Amino acid sequence: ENLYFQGMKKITPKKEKYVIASDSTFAPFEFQNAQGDYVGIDVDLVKRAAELQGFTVEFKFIGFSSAVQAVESGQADGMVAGMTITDDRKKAFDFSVPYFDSGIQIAVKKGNDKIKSYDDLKGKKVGVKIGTESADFLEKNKKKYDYSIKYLDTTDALYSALEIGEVDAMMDDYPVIGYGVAQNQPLATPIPREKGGSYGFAVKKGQNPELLEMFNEGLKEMKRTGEYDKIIGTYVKDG
Ligand SMILES: NC(=O)CC[C@H](N)C(=O)O
After folding, report:
1. 23 appears as a binding residue in the annotation
2. How far is the CA of 107 from the centre of ligand 1 (A)?
3. What is the spatial distance between Cα 101 and Cα 81, in angstroms, rounded to a whole number?
4. Which CATH architecture has domain 18-101+198-239?
5. What number of other Cβ atoms are within 10 A of residue 38's Cβ?
6. Of 34, 40, 107, 181, which is the most exposed, with the fewest CB atoms less than 10 Å away?
7. Family assignment (predicted)?
């Protein structure tokens, strides 16, 4: 309420260490730097939120579906993995305040001339990461456009499959493809993005409320100081 208040609400941890599950490579959200350490928007936001408030977090970069299962089972306390907030997922998870606006998009090989619309995917192969918003879109529209869906395990696997010609196109989150394009990966995006959803930090529904509160209060603080915008701008420098 007090907009001139320069402090923070005190959120008290209840565990010596909270385990945070994540995807294994999903740049710019979580990915390895030159030293092999994981960095990225998700990693920086969660680690800084914890630092701001005396929480200790331990990241496990295990894959998207693995992270979902770990939080559901109680083996991880929370997850961050560029995870879209949806109503269906709210049945299993409590989500933070949204921290990023996203959506999905097709990518094809740089130099591809054939594919300019979804209808051009007729008789083609589209790679996608199992368990994701992209997979849901492709299944919904498979009858309509008449492509075949190939299920892969990671975003790196999508890029590999596309590049060596195992698939004709892939579908993944648009800022992820965009980061790849910005570092000259051989990707093109001839079909407009499907905007939709924001990302959230997630805990199991009804569990670990203070961990969720810690993220929310940290995000508020980082938004107030501009640290949030500096973190994003560390990875996304597209003007
Ligand atoms: N890490 C991912 O692949 C997440 C993809 C998408 N945002 C989802 O929540 O399904």
Report:
1. yes
2. 16
3. 13
4. 3-Layer(aba) Sandwich (3.40)
5. 16
6. 34
7. Belongs to the binding-protein-dependent transport system permease family.
